């Protein structure tokens, strides 16, 4: 029990939520835990900054949609959180693996 | 999401969440007091 069961709710919010980005103000509210209700968790349970963990989660989620043989490549990053194609093109810094070649795999 | 669920829950545990911008107590009193509903009455059947 950390901050009255915030771990059991963060995962549910990440699962249920739409492609809306996750920031301090966005998740600070209906979360039931403010900035410090999340800082301790991100420091202890995860040990990684939000901008990298969210990007990794989006990449792991899109790894299946890229294999689902979808022709609308521009909408793949949009349906998962990346509001722009250039920002998602994160993939170069993470995998150094072609968008298209991976999409071909 | 129901009026029967809103009238039954006690405000002592309802007003402690920090995510509510405002509970709209004006409309809450308008829907409970003007319709003959006091603090925590058990209705016959609230859910559809």
Curated annotation (Swiss-Prot), chain A:
A GO molecular-function descriptor: DNA-binding transcription factor activity
Family annotation (SMART domains): HTH_ARAC
Pfam families according to UniProt: HTH_18
Keyword 4Fe-4S annotated: no
Annotated DNA-binding residue span(s): 25-46, 73-95
HTH araC/xylS-type domain residues: 8-105
Keyword rRNA processing: no
PROSITE patterns: HTH_ARAC_FAMILY_1 (PS00041), HTH_ARAC_FAMILY_2 (PS01124)
Keywords: Activator, DNA-binding, Transcription, Transcription regulation
Function: Probable transcriptional activator. Confers a multidrug resistance phenotype in E.coli.
Protein name: Transcriptional activator RamA
Originating organism: Klebsiella pneumoniae
Name of the gene encoding the protein in the UniProt record: ramA
From Swiss-Prot, chain B:
Superkingdom of origin: Bacteria
PTM-bearing positions, type N6-acetyllysine: 22-23
PTM per Swiss-Prot/TrEMBL: Acetylated on Lys-22 and Lys-23 in the presence of glucose. PatZ controls acetylation of Lys-23 but not of Lys-22. (Microbial infection) ADP-ribosylated on both alpha subunits by the phage T4 protein ModA. ADP-ribosylated on only one of the alpha subunits by the phage T4 protein Alt.
Domains as described in the record: The N-terminal domain is essential for RNAP assembly and basal transcription, whereas the C-terminal domain is involved in interaction with transcriptional regulators (such as CRP) and with upstream promoter elements.
Family according to the record: Belongs to the RNA polymerase alpha chain family.
Subunit structure: Homodimer. The RNAP catalytic core consists of 2 alpha, 1 beta, 1 beta' and 1 omega subunit. When a sigma factor is associated with the core the holoenzyme is formed, which can initiate transcription. Both the N- and C-terminus interact with different regions of transcriptional regulator CRP. The rRNA transcription and antitermination complex (rrnTAC) consists of RNAP, NusA, NusB, NusE (rpsJ), NusG, SubB, ribosomal protein S4, DNA and precursor rRNA; S4 is more flexible than other subunits.
Summary of the function given for this chain in its UniProt record: DNA-dependent RNA polymerase (RNAP) catalyzes the transcription of DNA into RNA using the four ribonucleoside triphosphates as substrates. This subunit plays an important role in subunit assembly since its dimerization is the first step in the sequential assembly of subunits to form the holoenzyme.
Protein name: DNA-directed RNA polymerase subunit alpha
Primary gene name: rpoA
Included stretch of the parent chain: 276 to 323 of 329
